[PDB]
Design an enzyme around this catalytic site. Sequence first.
Site, PDB file in Angstrom:
ATOM      1  N   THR B 101       0.935  -1.187   0.028  1.00 32.43           N
ATOM      2  CA  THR B 101       0.212  -0.111   0.055  1.00 32.43           C
ATOM      3  C   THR B 101       0.637   1.255  -0.016  1.00 32.43           C
ATOM      4  O   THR B 101       0.162   2.307  -0.473  1.00 32.43           O
ATOM      5  CB  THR B 101      -0.912   0.007   1.217  1.00 32.43           C
ATOM      6  N   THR B 102       2.195   1.313   0.451  1.00 29.09           N
ATOM      7  CA  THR B 102       2.932   2.372   0.524  1.00 29.09           C
ATOM      8  C   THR B 102       3.928   2.209  -0.882  1.00 29.09           C
ATOM      9  O   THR B 102       4.387   3.179  -1.340  1.00 29.09           O
ATOM     10  CB  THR B 102       3.824   2.506   1.703  1.00 29.09           C
ATOM     11  N   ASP B 399      -4.062  -8.173   6.929  1.00 32.15           N
ATOM     12  CA  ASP B 399      -3.074  -8.224   5.816  1.00 32.15           C
ATOM     13  C   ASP B 399      -2.469  -9.650   6.054  1.00 32.15           C
ATOM     14  O   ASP B 399      -2.096 -10.151   4.995  1.00 32.15           O
ATOM     15  CB  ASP B 399      -1.835  -7.184   6.345  1.00 32.15           C
TER      16      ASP B 399
END
Lengths: 523, 535, 448, 537
Positions: B101-102, B399
């Site tokens: 996600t980053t 996650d």
Amino acid sequence: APVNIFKAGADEERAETARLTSFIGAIAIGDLVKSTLGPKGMDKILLSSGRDASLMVTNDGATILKNIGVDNPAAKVLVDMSRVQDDEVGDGTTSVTVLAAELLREAESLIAKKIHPQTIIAGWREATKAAREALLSSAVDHGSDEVKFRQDLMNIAGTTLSSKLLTHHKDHFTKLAVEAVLRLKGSGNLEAIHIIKKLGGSLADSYLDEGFLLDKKIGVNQPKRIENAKILIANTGMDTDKIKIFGSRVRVDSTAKVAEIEHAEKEKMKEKVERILKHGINCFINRQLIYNYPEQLFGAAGVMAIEHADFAGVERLALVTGGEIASTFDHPELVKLGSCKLIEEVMIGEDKLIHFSGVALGEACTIVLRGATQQILDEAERSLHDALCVLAQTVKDSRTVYGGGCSEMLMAHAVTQLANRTPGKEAVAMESYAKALRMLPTIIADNAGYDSADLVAQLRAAHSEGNTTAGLDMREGTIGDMAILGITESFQVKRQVLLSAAEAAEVILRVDNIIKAAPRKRV
Amino acid sequence: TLAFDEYGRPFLIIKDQDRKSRLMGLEALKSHIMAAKAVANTMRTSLGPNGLDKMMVDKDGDVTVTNDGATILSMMDVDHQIAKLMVELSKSQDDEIGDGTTGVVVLAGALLEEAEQLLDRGIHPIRIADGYEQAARVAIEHLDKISDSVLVDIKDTEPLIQTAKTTLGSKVVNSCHRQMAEIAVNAVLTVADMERRDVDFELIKVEGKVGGRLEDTKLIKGVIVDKDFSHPQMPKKVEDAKIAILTCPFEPPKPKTKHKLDVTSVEDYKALQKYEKEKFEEMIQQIKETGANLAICQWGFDDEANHLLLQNNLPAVRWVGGPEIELIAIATGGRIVPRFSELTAEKLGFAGLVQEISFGTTKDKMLVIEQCKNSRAVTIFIRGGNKMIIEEAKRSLHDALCVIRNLIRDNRVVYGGGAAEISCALAVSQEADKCPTLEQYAMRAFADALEVIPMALSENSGMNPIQTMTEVRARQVKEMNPALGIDCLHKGTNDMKQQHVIETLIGKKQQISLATQMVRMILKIDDIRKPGESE
Amino acid sequence: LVDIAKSQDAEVGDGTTSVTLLAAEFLKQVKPYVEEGLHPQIIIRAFRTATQLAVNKIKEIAVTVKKADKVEQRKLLEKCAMTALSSKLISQQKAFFAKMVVDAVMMLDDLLQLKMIGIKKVQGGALEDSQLVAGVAFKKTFSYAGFEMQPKKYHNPKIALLNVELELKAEKDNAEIRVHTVEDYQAIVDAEWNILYDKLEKIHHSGAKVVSSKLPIGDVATQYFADRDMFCAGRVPEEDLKRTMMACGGSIQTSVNALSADVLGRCQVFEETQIGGERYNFFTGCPKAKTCTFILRGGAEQFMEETERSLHDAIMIVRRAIKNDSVVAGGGAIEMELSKYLRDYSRTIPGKQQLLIGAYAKALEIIPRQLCDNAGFDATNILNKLRARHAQGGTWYGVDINNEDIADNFEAFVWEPAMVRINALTAASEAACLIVSVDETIKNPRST
Amino acid sequence: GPLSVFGDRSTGETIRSQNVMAAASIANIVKSSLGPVGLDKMLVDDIGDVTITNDGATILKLLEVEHPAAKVLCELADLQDKEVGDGTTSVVIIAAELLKNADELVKQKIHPTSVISGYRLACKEAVRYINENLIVNTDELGRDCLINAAKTSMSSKIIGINGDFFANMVVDAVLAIKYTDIRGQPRYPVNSVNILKAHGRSQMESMLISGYALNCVVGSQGMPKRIVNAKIACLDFSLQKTKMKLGVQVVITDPEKLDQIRQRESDITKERIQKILATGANVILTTGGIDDMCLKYFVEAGAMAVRRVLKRDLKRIAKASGATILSTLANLEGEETFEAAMLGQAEEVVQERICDDELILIKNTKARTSASIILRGANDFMCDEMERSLHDALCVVKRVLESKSVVPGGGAVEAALSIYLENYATSMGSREQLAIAEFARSLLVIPNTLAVNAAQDSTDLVAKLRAFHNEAQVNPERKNLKWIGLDLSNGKPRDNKQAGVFEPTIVKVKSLKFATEAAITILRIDDLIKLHPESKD
């Protein structure tokens, strides 16, 4: 960030004011309730903006913080922590609040030393584990030999109450707390001990009702007093039964049939009451309201009936009378009745209440709380609730620790002795954890007005060389033996103060950036 | 000109042309790059296990401290057409893989930053985009050269637990580094369809309650539902449950159409009242005839039924919700019976211990079915000392569940810690000069952009980037390129195989592919037509 | 200059940007003359003369093939796809989408109706992760209690497409059931349950392992079907049921009274996958599927939207190419040759027409000019070379994309249907004739 | 991020496009007043003053502009007034067209300096062509070139009569003011011709005065209003009672002296006024003033005395009548001299009535025979335009006399260039042939605009003109078709040499140089930055 802004109506703070304003706003919470820690603290009054301001006087940190209305997004973190402490154990809410604030104050000082925030967190994790062992190895157990167990409950009740309004009334309200719980001999429902608040008399004039009090006075045309009564409780319909057919009309050729059906309507209500009366009862309590027609039938039968004592009143009566809800009556031989000695009404505070005295299997009680003012009644009620909540758990987990700062110094000792075995990069952070732990006996002495400069030095010096029971003597202003004085705290209350402050405090240290969405409904 | 013609008349082409905003030139490309730098720098500090978290304050006053990029960006009031697309990039990665996600934002940023000096050299915007795709294939083909695992999804779950530790190592629940890693392994392996390799996350329910601490997180082989016993004196313990699941309310049958019953005589009035009193006996005895001793009801109960439940020693719950009654049926292996008269023993559910769990001083007393036989549904119960850690822990466990599913679908793995990124950057550089036909500048720029990740990780770890990359990269060309990475404490050597830093192959493959396409569609634009005033 | 693009979108399918620019240039070339007399009648006469000449020449130079119903014709369609997918957000996937487009249309019947090819966007994945589905698919609309059951593994299901309600509430909105007895009270209650079950049993005993309806299917039907080993999904839109009927080879029935094996569809695989994260219900395996569905994958809504448009363009171009194989070179190649014919024409006529027909021809340079100015390529010198090459050699010389030089677009197989330019010329000239014919404008002051 | 200047930054095609429109906006005005078929403009100011004119320079200077690229064209017209004298319309038309066509070149990725270089090369070559294709000097035509030039210019104005009434006054007034000087400079100072206005009789009763018309009056109604064989005394000091200076005080201790000292203030004055008349002066002209005491002495003496005239006017009278201007007293330590021999002469000095006003005429003057012209109009509107039109005609004739070379009008010169320059482009045409061709094509705006304003055929009338100029250059048979222009009254070509349509050579050589350079400057304004105005500080 402030250069080339691509936000609609939002803003953000990074690395400069994000942590500064977070530490200031959150640490301030501790200073607010700091004054309430210890047996000599002062109480607060909280005021509203108006519209029935409903003034509240209180001591407990949880009741203070939950009514402030904190707007700072970081300070809210500690507010929620104090809520959890109140919900779990119901005590120590001030101690966990100020401990977390002192930990955060040290963190700001450690950032000023250019210590990476992840190093500070890592150090606190190791220090927290060290403190947890100090509590495990110092717990005091109580098993059999009930003459010693009961004394422990008196010590726990006295300790909690000493910090609230009920200070110089300990010889009355200590027994109201310990004995009320012991009489339950069952699940810690915390609803089986009801408190009725009345004006008139002093706090010392409160007493414990051995039986059970009901509202909703004894009828109109019904006996007022029956000796050796059999009690039946119910959760059924008295009138407008409208038996289970939806969309049914009476359609007749003349009004003569309507009158005949009206008689049938009452005949079935008569049969219904007779089916109840065949039980052989003296007292009838029904959750649902009683209408004019069954009231005459119960009166003619010489049986009293109470309507809508409370929604849960019937459930509480079932527990203290030894019966069953009985929402339907079709097999009287399968329905258990209760029994009592007196059903007479008593006058308490110029209000007639129905007193069920001498009730068999009475696993419940009522405390009659008297006071001069409404503020006295409300704070005194809360004091009873707080003590009963702790006692209901102490009777389940008999492990206790020594109070008066003893446990805090033992935890700080373990952290210090192990911190000195670690490299400086992390030891500086573990030492800060111990320093926060020692702030608690400092705050307690400082609120009373004692020379904390000597009490802290003497207490630490004592615990440095054995004396694992040493603590603060808040009567003389010296260091005494907690075991002889009888100053103890519940293990579970102390465990959660340690763990909650450490877990909550990390939340603030981990944040370097606050992004604030555009507000709505602000013009 | 606008609003003035050569003859003095107004010149009007489009509505409200005097209140529009238009930019083409080369400054539209510079504006897109400028916005991208703001986004990439925003998340730069939240990359890797040594990154710091963000506090997001919602429009309604709610505050959440977040680690995952999807939530961080979704809660921002972004007013730029291209920056929103960079947010959508992170969302797509969260939907496909659930890890980077980053990473896709930092990588896409570096590619756009390199475009700045490439444009200043006079390279056509399209040539820059085309060169990135040509080099991207080289990084992908290299990425697939180094991969191996021996996961069988039976019992040898050691490398699977290690993968979960890598995923959770960056989250706020490291106090349960092992405990939650094992919960995630057991949660997925006990519900996945190993014969088709299909994992259905609907079979893993995520529940929680404020109170306790992270160490109290448990995997329950069963279901947790809100308790609401019809009668207050029902037993608190069922030793052997035979569960009857109905969606029929416990009241005499009512027709669904307009009815309007006619009552005329007293014989009709009294008879109808009598007949109805006899119907409550049937709806209850029809349950007992099947051997059932616990009823599940989507609807409520009438008062007369509540007493009959007591008489027949038949505990029951009322007002069970939609997914709750469906979940109980799945966990217990039964069927929902439309009516009371259709009840049969063959449709009963089978379960063991059923009891309540009390929490502190609260009145929730949740009802849990703890024992079951060959259930294909599990519940994960998250606890914590405050609301803040619990809500983030729920997402952190999500996650962990996703990366396990990703290995089940494709069991090829790569080395993390920056090792895969540096190795790909070296591979592209080696081919960048074989052959520098036209796009030498873009092939080298791509290779340099790939290193933005181990360099940002070095910064967040407190190390000097250019000094760290020099030592690490040199070691990987002096010897047969071993999987070397970086860390803050170094953990002895930087061998990712010995540190057990495991990431999914298909995760990084999608990070490269999605970033590559997103960069293209926002460079190949030369006209910004944002409106002006709203009125 | 916008309305003419709407017409080109219908007649050509991609004649969009080019017709607006050409029409604008037609006015620019005459702009320096219309300010000094030049009666509008002669302007219209010259516009019409040059227009008719240009479209006649195109027909005389377009090329056709004699290799119909052979691999050579399929390859011709792929060549058309290469230019249809040009100038789109497509870099290396031209042959990936083109192969699917050409076959997706060739698999249609001799109507080639565009409604037989559906395109749906699913978020997640790259351009090369898209798939062409032989049958149909839908997005798994609103579910009921029990839809976590009914396994999704079928190897030879039959498909019942129904318009029947399967809820308990079988009410006609006008029924009042007057009951006088308790025996009749229960009989009515039982009847309502019997009506629902009667319909369900008529659907069963048919082999229709998969039942689909545009109307609700209630909780009782879901549980009944689950225990009877049948799959259901209701609230399916009519647009997909129509395509499903043509894909599965069956019929859509409203009443359950006349169901049999002779109205059901058939397929080989009925499954629900997890493409893009959400569940999507696919059919495939019917050999007599008259339709197809193309599922697009991409990294953004806007990314996929532009892709979808490039698929609509390519489908339309190859559809017309099947019916009309007359093609011309792309780029600006045909425009340079058309200007040659017109210049030779105009230079043989005396009088005012020399300033008007020649101006029309000059406007035709805007295409090879814009095809160079947008990426450099030294447009001035490229035009200087084109005007010299077209005067001596072939007629298909255009501008290369790789090298900044001239190339023969015919040998490079840069082809487009001849009708693309015939229609573009018609609309561009027609607009020019309408614009220059206005002398006065009146604007009413009322705006409400 | 962006430039931190508090104004606006506009670059590239934004300013390049605006520069051309600003130039076109000004050209769109003057194109309608080109040639003898143009029509007059009316300008009205904010307060209600109405001005009617057909002078291009007057119009542009009166109209307010904002864009700095429009101010350049306004200045361009002012250059024609100083350098040429009648070219105030076509100089803006040519310059604006060079800018328009130059824009079309640079938008094709042609560097601005490639266009500028071509414009400078073609302009220099165009001048070379003109100087090799001239018609004739002013020696073979004699007077005809002066009447023809005067009428050619006036054909564009309200006094554009078919007759020679005005043309004779223009040419004769210029020829009558010939002044020789060293190194062969036959000066014609037309600025010395005094032009008067009167709202009175028709245009055909204008006067041509031999001498000087003095815009003053005699004043006191006791002086002679007609003197024959006058001596003219031109002086520049006041005739009034003598005042004491600021630094000198009169302080008296003996009252008996009050009368002599006080009286001296008037005696010292009258002693002087007697001595300017003792020389025989008949007309006394002063730029100062004459008080009531002094006026008596001119009346009693029978002399004319004119007061409060302009210094520029008296100097012209003295030079034309042979007088010297005396401002003080001198002549070798003399107390009072008044230079008796320095008086001028005139055959007659008379005050006449000029339609309810008074005017003093000094006739023939006997030294230089200067000139004045009194114009007559129906009203003030005509009179103002007539003065401007006469000035133009006087200037054009001056240019003919100074530069003894004429070129054809009617667009003939531009048509000749439109052929020669196109061929020139093929000799040196390597990269600048586009700029050279566009420079030549820009020239056709003149015969094109002339046809439009005359409501004549456009693309056929001018095309036919070019055919005649083409044959003269591609068929070297000495066809002599280089002097053919447009006849705007018939829509046919004409021979401008036989028609008498002549313009001074400099009217076109100078216009091409100034118009080209002005456009080149504007073509280098691709970037513009504008700062916020300072109004309130």
